[PDB]
Amino acid sequence: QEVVIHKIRINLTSTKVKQLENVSANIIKNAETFKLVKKGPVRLPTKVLKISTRKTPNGEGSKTWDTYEMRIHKRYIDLEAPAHIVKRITQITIEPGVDVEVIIAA
């Protein structure tokens, strides 16, 4: 009918850690409910985006600096399923701030 098992990679990216974790948990729950071939929520090394600015606008004063850093959390999950099921899983369980991304197919 439709059920032919593919190779599905799902990417998750955010700045908020807790939200991301929640999303991951939700995904895992969904997987459990659908009980499919599963590879765990693989965590990629968090990416710290750095900026260095002189605190002054004008330049006069003791030369003081800023370290404005933005940390990126990137995590991926691997599933073997029909694509429709994956879509269904991912159409719900969306939280604002977390980017849900699907590779789909081998």
Binding site: T15, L49, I51, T53, K55, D66, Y68, M70
Partner: protein, 53 residues
């Protein structure tokens, strides 16, 4: 509408022009921000950059 009104401005401090001010001075072009420094500092939390350490 003049015969010319432009000199080659593809690179250098002539090409890069800020999002907010339009300053050619102190421009942060890292990660493709193109925001001049002071302005960036003022609105850093809005971008998502924070001062942790």
């Amino acid at each position: 509408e003049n015969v010319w009104y432009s000199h080659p401005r593809k690179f250098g401090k002539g090409s890069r022009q800020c999002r907010i001010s339009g300053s050619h001075s102190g421009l942060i072009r890292k990660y493709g921000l193109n925001i001049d420094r002071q302005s960036f500092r003022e609105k850093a939390n809005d971008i998502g950059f924070y001062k942790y350490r």
